[PDB]
Amino acid sequence: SRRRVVITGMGMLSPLGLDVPSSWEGILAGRSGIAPIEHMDLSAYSTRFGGSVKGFNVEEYLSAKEARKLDLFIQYGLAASFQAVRDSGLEVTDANRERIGVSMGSGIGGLTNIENNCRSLFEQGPRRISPFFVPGSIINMVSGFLSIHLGLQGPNYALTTAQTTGTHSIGMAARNIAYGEADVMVAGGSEMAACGLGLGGFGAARALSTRNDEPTRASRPWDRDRDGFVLSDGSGALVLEELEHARARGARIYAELVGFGMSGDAFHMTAPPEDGAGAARCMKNALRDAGLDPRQVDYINAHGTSTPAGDIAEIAAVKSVFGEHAHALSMSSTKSMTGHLLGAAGAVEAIFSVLALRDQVAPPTINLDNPDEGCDLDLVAHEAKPRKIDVALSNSFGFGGTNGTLVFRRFA
Amino acid sequence: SRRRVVITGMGMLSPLGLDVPSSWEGILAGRSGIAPIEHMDLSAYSTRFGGSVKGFNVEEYLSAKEARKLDLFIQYGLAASFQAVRDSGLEVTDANRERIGVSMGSGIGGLTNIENNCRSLFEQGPRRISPFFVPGSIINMVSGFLSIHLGLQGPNYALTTAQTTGTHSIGMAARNIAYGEADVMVAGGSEMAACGLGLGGFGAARALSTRNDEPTRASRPWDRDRDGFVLSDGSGALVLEELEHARARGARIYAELVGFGMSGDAFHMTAPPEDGAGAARCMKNALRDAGLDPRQVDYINAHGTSTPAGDIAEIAAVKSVFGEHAHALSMSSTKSMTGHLLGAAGAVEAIFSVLALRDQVAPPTINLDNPDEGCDLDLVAHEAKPRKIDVALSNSFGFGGTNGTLVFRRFA
Ligand SMILES: NC(=O)N1CCN(c2ccc(F)cc2)CC1
Numbered sequence: 066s067r068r069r070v071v072i073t074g075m076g077m078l079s080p081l082g083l084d085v086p087s088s089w090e091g092i093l094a095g096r097s098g099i100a101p102i103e104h105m106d107l108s109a110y111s112t113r114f115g116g117s118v119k120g121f122n123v124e125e126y127l128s129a130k131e132a133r134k135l136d137l138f139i140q141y142g143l144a145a146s147f148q149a150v151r152d153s154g155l156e157v158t159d160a161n162r163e164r165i166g167v168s169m170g171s172g173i174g175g176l177t178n179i180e181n182n183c184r185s186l187f188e189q190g191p192r193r194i195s196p197f198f199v200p201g202s203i204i205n206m207v208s209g210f211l212s213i214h215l216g217l218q219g220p221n222y223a224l225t226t227a228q229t230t231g232t233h234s235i236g237m238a239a240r241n242i243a244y245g246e247a248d249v250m251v252a253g254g255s256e257m258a259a260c261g262l263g264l265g266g267f268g269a270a271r272a273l274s275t276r277n278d279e280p281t282r283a284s285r286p287w288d289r290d291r292d293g294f295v296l297s298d299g300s301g302a303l304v305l306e307e308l309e310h311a312r313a314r315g316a317r318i319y320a321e322l323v324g325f326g327m328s329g330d331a332f333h334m335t336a337p338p339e340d341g342a343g344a345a346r347c348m349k350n351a352l353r354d355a356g357l358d359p360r361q362v363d364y365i366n367a368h369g370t371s372t373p374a375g376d377i378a379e380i381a382a383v384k385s386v387f388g389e390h391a392h393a394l395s396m397s398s399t400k401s402m403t404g405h406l407l408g409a410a411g412a413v414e415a416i417f418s419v420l421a422l423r424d425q426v427a428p429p430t431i432n433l434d435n436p437d438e439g440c441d442l443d444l445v446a447h448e449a450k451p452r453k454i455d456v457a458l459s460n461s462f463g464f465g466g467t468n469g470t471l472v473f474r475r476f477a
Numbered sequence: 478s479r480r481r482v483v484i485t486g487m488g489m490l491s492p493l494g495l496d497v498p499s500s501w502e503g504i505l506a507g508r509s510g511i512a513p514i515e516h517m518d519l520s521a522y523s524t525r526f527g528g529s530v531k532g533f534n535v536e537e538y539l540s541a542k543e544a545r546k547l548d549l550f551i552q553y554g555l556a557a558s559f560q561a562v563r564d565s566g567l568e569v570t571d572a573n574r575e576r577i578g579v580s581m582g583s584g585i586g587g588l589t590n591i592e593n594n595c596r597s598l599f600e601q602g603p604r605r606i607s608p609f610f611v612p613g614s615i616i617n618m619v620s621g622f623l624s625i626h627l628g629l630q631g632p633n634y635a636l637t638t639a640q641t642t643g644t645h646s647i648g649m650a651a652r653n654i655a656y657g658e659a660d661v662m663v664a665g666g667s668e669m670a671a672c673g674l675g676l677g678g679f680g681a682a683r684a685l686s687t688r689n690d691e692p693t694r695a696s697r698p699w700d701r702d703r704d705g706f707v708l709s710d711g712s713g714a715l716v717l718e719e720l721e722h723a724r725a726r727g728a729r730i731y732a733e734l735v736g737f738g739m740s741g742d743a744f745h746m747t748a749p750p751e752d753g754a755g756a757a758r759c760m761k762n763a764l765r766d767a768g769l770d771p772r773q774v775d776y777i778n779a780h781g782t783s784t785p786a787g788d789i790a791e792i793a794a795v796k797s798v799f800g801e802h803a804h805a806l807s808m809s810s811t812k813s814m815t816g817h818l819l820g821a822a823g824a825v826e827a828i829f830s831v832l833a834l835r836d837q838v839a840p841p842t843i844n845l846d847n848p849d850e851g852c853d854l855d856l857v858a859h860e861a862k863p864r865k866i867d868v869a870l871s872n873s874f875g876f877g878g879t880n881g882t883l884v885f886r887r888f889a
């Protein structure tokens with residue numbers, strides 16, 4: 066037997082806005098967050114654009130002195146997490162602090178910091194490496210710093226499952242609460258890889274869209290002219306809470322987390338299998354986990370990265386899992402607007418899945434001008450679609466063939 | 478309802494050996510694996526030694542053509558993983574591959590790789606960054622590559638909780654099996670942070686021993702002349718298996734994992750509290766999880782990093798948890814011999830804890846010539862101590878105030 070887990074606070078930094086309601090406003094308007102990257106020489110790079118967080122002010126959250134110690138990915142993680150805790154109204158007390166934990170992850174961690182400390186190392190030698198290099202760059206420091214700032218003494222950890230991080234972080238946090246290891250968890254992910262090493266590293270594998278002329282049209286999941294993913298920055302955090310705990314203090318409940326699925330493709334380091342066999346098993350696992358029949362699913366927030374092999378794999382997976390229901394559900398890539406926030410993708414897409422439930426609206430797949438061969442599902446081309454949504458899925462399918470699926474349900 | 482979990486396979490690279498047996502022989506003979514570092518010129522560094530893996534042949538495991546693309550931490554993770562699975566005698570099949578997963582972690586991941594690609598980027602341009610940069614450097618690719626080579630389709634993930642990584646990886650993997658998400662898990666961690674940025678970054682914070690002129694005597698946990706930890710490399714992997722699944726196949730069972738604790742200090746980014754309050758919460762959680770009287774605990778493999786504040790915190794935590802029984806159990810730090818394998822520390826030390834149960838011997842704390850103020854427990858100074866061990870506990874503490882405790886006992 067198992068406790069029920071609800072969403073009582075959400076927080077976000079995205080290429081679309083500095084919080085949830087502003088990000089969600091852009092999502093439903095089909096606005097693009099993608100733009101050429103500024104204050105950075107990308108002359109020798111084949112990709113010169115992505116989704117930046119615009120106008121982030123870390124001094125709303127931290128002193129200038131504490132923020133100087135921390136990589137951007139950690140700043141962004143703390144911002145979404147502080148937002149999510151404030152959004153929840155939860156009061157931390159000596160009576161509950163041991164029951165409140167954190168699992169905020171990252172796919173790639175502190176590349177920006179690693180790059181600036183490399184610059185100092187090569188130019189001037191090791192004696193110019195920042196004393197805060199290690200604690201200021203390691204992925205578990207969003208969980209670390211958040212626990213220290215708020216006095217959280219519950220489970221304290223960090224996932225790193227590349228592009229699956231945010232989905233796994235939220236799912237495993239839900240498990241902690243369901244099986245009684247915590248009553249509250251702050252979970253999600255953050256990322257800032259759209260630095261030299263992120264653009265160069267992914268650009269070297271030719272994984273990135275090179276559509277420098279039309280950056281807002283670059284991210285075009287299931288469109289026959291897609292040429293790979295758009296690199297994006299930001300964070301999502303959710304406050305996950307045991308139902309009775311949330312009801313007792315009179316929390317505002319956005320939605321219930323009913324289902325979590327995991328699988329491994331065991332196929333290829335970067336490419337999914339053509340038929341999405343792994344993504345199929347993971348969605349089936351998530352629906353079994355939630356005790357739901359595939360027929361009950363109304364809305365899927367796809368992984369939808371705009372990679373040719375990735376997008377077609379997800380069409381196959383859904384047709385295989387949903388059979389004659391596959392056309393009835395709506396499925397959209399919000400990455401058409403946000404780009405791919407990698408380890409944070411699952412976190413911001415879980416929030417969009419929750420908000421699709423609250424507002425009864427499927428977010429668009431923008432730029433889906435010419436669906437590809439086989440891409441005949443309801444991919445919500447171009448514009449948001451108001452519709453009935455009781456059950457929403459959020460999928461992540463990342464490098465190493467690691468799969469995550471979250472099942473959200475309306476709560477009333 | 479909650480199932481029991483046993484250890485059926487173990488694997489290791491350490492500064493003492495290229496497998497578990499050779500490493501364990503070094504542990505029981507009090508041998509140091511710490512030496513001046515040869516793979517690079519450290520004359521501008523304030524620390525020039527640590528625990529290298531000596532004579533590692535990746536060609537025992539992988540083609541030189543796959544090896545070339547992978548960071549040593551991934552190479553070390555796979556080697557220990559391959560050892561653990563072979564040691565288990567487990568055969569992967571279509572009937573069970575969905576029921577076998579992997580959780581192999583790292584604190585820092587592919588810092589060597591990311592540094593060298595940073596050098597290429599700075600000296601030559603983005604066009605000289607390896608196409609394998611991302612899949613060859615990111616922390617989740619031990620779990621990824623292991624699943625690809627063995628065909629593991631179970632839960633596929635990675636923890637990154639700094640120096641607590643291996644302990645958390647093992648504990649959460651046991652929970653997966655406990656709660657029916659998997660019947661088999663390959664779990665542990667790997668680390669190779671001995672690059673310029675690693676030795677430099679830990680050196681900038683003055684966290685490392687600077688005993689360059691006597692490296693084998695540098696790691697001296699609870700000794701009054703200790704002066705920081707010794708950075709070491711390697712990997713530990715265990716096969717965790719549901720008890721009845723292990724019984725059904727006549728598996729050889731080394732020990733039972735009965736207990737898993739996590740807590741957060743919520744104290745400091747890098748310093749443990751003097752009183753050991755977070756470590757004490759974590760051990761109490763693990764002992765209650767195991768349904769034990771604290772007097773049943775015979776052996777503690779301490780975190781024991783040879784830092785001033787870390788070592789004394791641990792005495793205080795153990796005195797607070799076990800009271801008068803603190804004076805009857807044996808506690809030692811195998812870090813005295815191996816140094817600090819960071820995210821891999823929890824993995825090798827869990828294997829040392831299991832082997833203490835198999836052979837009925839407490840490994841020594843070497844170099845404990847002058848125990849510090851209040852360091853007055855049985856710390857097994859200098860020499861291995863044959864003794865009765867029914868219950869063994871392995872502790873890790875890390876940056877972000879993240880704590881882990883594992884509880885093992887003999888299985889008949
Ligand atoms: N070249 C190869 O045979 N592999 C597979 C493709 N590849 C890759 C793809 C996308 C990405 F973002 C990172 C790496 C590089 C390694």
Ligand SMILES: NC(=O)N1CCN(c2ccc(F)cc2)CC1
Binds near residue numbers: 200679681683747
């Ligand atoms: N401000 C200072 O003098 N430093 C930097 C922060 N902190 C630290 C400790 C251990 C470590 F491995 C990395 C960083 C304490 C020492």
Ligand SMILES: NC(=O)N1CCN(c2ccc(F)cc2)CC1
Binds near residue numbers: 770772773802
């Ligand atoms: N006086 C002591 O220090 N003891 C008493 C408790 N004891 C124990 C043994 C088996 C068991 F099932 C429960 C408890 C072990 C050590």
